[PDB]
Amino acid sequence: TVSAPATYGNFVLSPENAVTAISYHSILADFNSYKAHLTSGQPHLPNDS
Amino acid sequence: TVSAPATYGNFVLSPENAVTAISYHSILADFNSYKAHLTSGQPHLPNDS
After folding, report:
1. What is the four-CA torsion angle of A36, A38, A40, A42, rounded to 10 degrees?
2. Do B31 and A19 touch (CB under 8 A)?
3. Alpha helix (H) ranges present in chain A?
4. CB B30 within 8 A of CB B49
5. For residue B29, which of B16, B43, B44 has the smallest C-alpha distance?
6. How many whole angstroms separate alpha carbon B45 and alpha carbon B40?
7. Min Cα separation A9/chain B (Å)
8. Which residues lie below 8 Å from residue B49, measured CB to CB, with a gap of 6+?
9. Are B35 and A26 within 8 A, CB to CB?
10. Contacts of residue B22 in chain A, CB cutoff 8 Å?
């Protein structure tokens, strides 16, 4: 037996991203995540998108 | 006796702006106000920064 995933994942956009989409045409994933790490100064995020 | 302000009112950058300044060369003042009133769907805004 193998414990394979049973469901497709999802990647819902954050509302803050939508303001950054309407203006300049670019989107970085998890915009709230980077904001909380620049304040602490930590460079290594736990996870990526 | 005209009532004139006794002190300069300093502007301050929002923490959300700190990532936007790095990822691209632009800043939207009151960026949290844009996200709040855009997610609300209301075309108008209270006051400018």
Report:
1. 110
2. yes
3. 15-22, 31-40
4. yes
5. B16
6. 11
7. 24
8. B11, B29, B30
9. no
10. 38
